Structures are given as C-alpha cells and as structure tokens.
Amino acid sequence: SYSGYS
C-alpha cells in the first residue's frame, strides 16, 4: 500500500 502525499 501507499500512505501520505504524492
């Protein structure tokens, strides 16, 4: 998974 800001 991805967590945060892109």
| Resolution (Å units) | 0.6
- Alpha carbons 6 and 1: distance in angstroms, whole number: 13
For residue 3, how far is the Cα from the chain centroid?
3
Q: Obtained via which technique? A: electron diffraction
Report residue 4 as tokens: 């945060």
b/e 1-6 (16+ beta carbons within 10 angstroms → b): eeeeee
